[PDB]
Amino acid sequence: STLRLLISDSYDPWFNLAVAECIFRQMPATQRVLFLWRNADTVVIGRAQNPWKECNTRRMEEDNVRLARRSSGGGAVFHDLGNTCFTFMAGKPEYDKTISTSIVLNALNALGVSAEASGRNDLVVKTVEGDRKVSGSAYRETKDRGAHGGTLLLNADLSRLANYLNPDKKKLAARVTNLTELLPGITHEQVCEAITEAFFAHYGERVEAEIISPNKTPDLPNFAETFARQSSWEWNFGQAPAFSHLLDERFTWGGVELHFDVEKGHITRAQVFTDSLNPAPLEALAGRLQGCLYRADMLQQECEALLVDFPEQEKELRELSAWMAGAVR
Numbered sequence: 001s002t003l004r005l006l007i008s009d010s011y012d013p014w015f016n017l018a019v020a021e022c023i024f025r026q027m028p029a030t031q032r033v034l035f036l037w038r039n040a041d042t043v044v045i046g047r048a049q050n051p052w053k054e055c056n057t058r059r060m061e062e063d064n065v066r067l068a069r070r071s072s073g074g075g076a077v078f079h080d081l082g083n084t085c086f087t088f089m090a091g092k093p094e095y096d097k098t099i100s101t102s103i104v105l106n107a108l109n110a111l112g113v114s115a116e117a118s119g120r121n122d123l124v125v126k127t128v129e130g131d132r133k134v135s136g137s138a139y140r141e142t143k144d145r146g147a148h149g150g151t152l153l154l155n156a157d158l159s160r161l162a163n164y165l166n167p168d169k170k171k172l173a174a175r176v177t178n179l180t181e182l183l184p185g186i187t188h189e190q191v192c193e194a195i196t197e198a199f200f201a202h203y204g205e206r207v208e209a210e211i212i213s214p215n216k217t218p219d220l221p222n223f224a225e226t227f228a229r230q231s232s233w234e235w236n237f238g239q240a241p242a243f244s245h246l247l248d249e250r251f252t253w254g255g256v257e258l259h260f261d262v263e264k265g266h267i268t269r270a271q272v273f274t275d276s277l278n279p280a281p282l283e284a285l286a287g288r289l290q291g292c293l294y295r296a297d298m299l300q301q302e303c304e305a306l307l308v309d310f311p312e313q314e315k316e317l318r319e320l321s322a323w324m325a326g327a328v329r
């Protein structure tokens with residue numbers, strides 16, 4: 001058919017995320033996919049974040065919370081079973097982010113809630129007490145496809161993210177509602193059905209649900225390998241950075257932490273972390289700092305030898321250099 005419907009029966013965040021990843025990069029862009037899942041207690045971090053800084057790893061071990069690193073940039077989110085997650089994927093040029101949005105909107109209204117889009121990534125429900133945000137989401141796009149992933153708040157414990165994150169000095173000095181409040185009784189199963197029907201209605205087509213779990217791996221290419229990597233401690237946590245120097249700042253487009261050693265006046269190793277949505281140029285910068293003379297003018301030279309390779313991140317990259325120029329010497 002033209003449709004693939006995947007329902008996870010597993011609360012394993014590394015399995016669920018593994019599926020979202022295969023859908024986006026492993027699957028062919030021939031079909032249209034809806035994946036619905038939920039996670040047990042998990043902190044999800046952007047791919048370039050330092051969880052040893054971002055997260056209270058000790059409290060996470062105690063209270064039994066998993067850490068998962070996603071392949072996209074950005075900052076950290078907390079998930080419990082009170083979150084219902086979705087991902088839509090469709091090949092281009094026929095796909096756009098309005099389609100998935102309209103489907104979730106459809107399901108929410110069908111469920112009994114007066115919902116509409118607020119800006120790009122948010123869905124809000126209209127209330128006499130005002131707009132309530134019930135859903136966050138993110139969009140990822142390719143030459144051949146677009147993907148829309150997000151979470152709905154059914155009965156999430158909203159006081160939990162604080163327990164599992166460390167205070168970020170420079171970030172601080174730089175509404176949200178559960179559906180069970182509006183629909184007492186709402187459940188994961190009901191939301192999944194409603195989104196599924198709205199999915200089928202829009203496309204004018206019906207497929208059977210492919211129920212998937214680790215006990216029973218899904219019909220996806222290179223999944224075994226993707227799952228093995230996603231659930232690996234080396235990927236999610238990785239070794240903590242142990243460097244002598246640290247340059248850090250909080251910009252409007254993300255925090256940056258530049259760790260490095262200096263020996264004989266030159267950088268002998270470096271590592272960058274960020275919650276930026278586009279870490280790639282920061283990664284490239286770290287690569288170019290290897291062996292660099294530890295001097296302001298020099299840090300700029302390497303940081304502007306990339307501007308040509310990262311046109312879309314021009315502004316940022318120069319908030320960067322102008323920062324290294326005043327932060328070093």
Ligand SMILES: NC(=O)CCCCc1cc2c(cc1O)Oc1cc(O)ccc1N2
Pocket residue numbers: 017044046070072073074075076077138139149277
């Ligand atoms: N609220 C924040 O600080 C998030 C900033 C980054 C935005 C972003 C978030 C997510 C994202 C992409 C993205 O660009 O993908 C996600 C996948 C997931 O399973 C669970 C959670 C996420 N979250």
